Amino acid sequence: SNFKEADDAIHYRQSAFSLMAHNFGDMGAMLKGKKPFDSEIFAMRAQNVAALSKLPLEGFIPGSDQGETEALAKIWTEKSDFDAKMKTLQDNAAALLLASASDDKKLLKQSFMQVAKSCKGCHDVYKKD
Amino acid sequence: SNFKEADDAIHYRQSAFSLMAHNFGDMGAMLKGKKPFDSEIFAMRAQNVAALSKLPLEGFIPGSDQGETEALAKIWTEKSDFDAKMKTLQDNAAALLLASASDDKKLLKQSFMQVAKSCKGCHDVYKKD
Ligand code: HEC
Ligand code: HEC
């Protein structure tokens, strides 16, 4: 295994998701007008989200559904669909990174919403209530 | 500020460092023979370390030296030198990513050691004992 104990795998994936959320939420705040929009900071965030999105799958090792985690056990009996949702997150984050190189606000919002749908769609099925 | 409270900034930088350490340590384990060396996994790790190294500086916001943190207060009275160490970490991680595209083991070890010196050199000065 890549981790000494199961708790290390849980902490790893949780930390990657938390960092993803900070960067993704800053993009959302800018698009929603909650803070000033800045195209360079937006692109920096999109790069961070794309890089961070490659990290958490590693942490979903067998046997790491016990203890202090919000990951449902059915992740590991439906692992093919789970992995496919994670892969789609990657593609969507790559599209948002590409969109961040342009200044078309509607295309930015559209690409952002596709990533957001990836986050929520996986959570609704595979994260504890 | 990019963070709602100081504890959020602390958690952010701590999480980025923790993820960096997992990826960096896997490269070290492979170079030291503690686990089988794999050039593709090594390159994946080098990319992750380079991406993650761009994240933690954001978290060192003014006033976030109180509470549950190992960051010393002198980070903020010596912030120029601190930032310069972080920038050098970036350059070193970029060099290790470039080295990971080749199969020269001595050059890989040399580039890895330069990053490791960045980690320890900053810790020795700016992280609590
Ligand atoms: C499945 C394919 C997921 C996708 C895509 C995204 N997330 Fe998620 N997330 C998932 C799980 C199974 C869990 C629980 C992990 C655990 O071990 O507890 C999470 C958790 C989070 C969290 C909380 C992290 C923590 O501090 O404990 C956050 C903030 C989070 N996820 C955010 C997030 C965002 C912003 C996403 C899209 C950009 C996203 N996740 C995708 C499963 C999946
Ligand atoms: C200064 C310029 C640093 C460089 C370069 C690196 N690190 Fe570091 N690290 C630094 C500080 C000030 C702190 C304390 C942060 C806090 O708020 O507590 C840390 C902390 C860590 C940790 C512990 C994280 C945690 O879970 O709390 C780790 C595992 C860590 N740092 C690893 C690490 C590695 C592997 C580095 C090089 C690749 C590296 N850091 C560079 C300051 C600095």
Which residue in B91, B84, B65 sits closest to B122, CA to CA? B84
β partners of residue A127: A71
Phi/psi of residue B63, nearest 5 degrees = 85, 5
**A48 Cα–ligand 2 center, Å:** 18
Judge contact between B86 and B59, C-beta under 8 A: no
Distance CA B33, CA A93 (A): 35
Contacts of A97 (CB under 8 A, 6+ apart): A43, A46, A47, A49, A50
CA distances from A31 to A19, A90, A99, A104, A118 (A): 19, 21, 13, 11, 18
Rounded to 5 degrees, what angle do the CA atoms A49, B85, B125 make?
120
Judge contact between A49 and A98, C-beta under 8 A: no
In this structure, the residue with its CA closest to atom 35 of ligand 1 is: A21
Contacts of A65 (CB under 8 A, 6+ apart): A71, A72, A73, A75, A76
Distance CA A25, CA A116 (A): 10
How many structural domains is chain A composed of?
A: 1
Question: Is A30 near chain B, with CB under 8 Å?
Answer: no
**A61 Cα–ligand 2 center, Å:** 25
Asked if A26 and B51 come within 8 Å (Cβ–Cβ), the reply is: no
Judge contact between A37 and A80, C-beta under 8 A: no
Q: Which residue has the tokens 């790559």?
A: A94
β partners of residue B71: B127
Judge contact between A71 and A65, C-beta under 8 A: yes
Q: What is the DSSP string of A43-103?
A: HHHHHHHHHHHTSGGGG--TT--SSS--B-GGGTTSHHHHHHHHHHHHHHHHHHHHHTTS-
Q: Could you say which ligand is closest to the alpha carbon of residue B80?
A: 2
Judge contact between B111 and B89, C-beta under 8 A: no
CATH number of residue A3's parent domain: 1.20.120.10
Phi/psi of residue A7, nearest 5 degrees = -60, -30
Judge contact between A99 and A55, C-beta under 8 A: no
Contacts of A1 (CB under 8 A, 6+ apart): A9, A61
Handedness of CA A89, A95, A101, A102 (dihedral sign): negative
Range of the domain at B42: 1-129
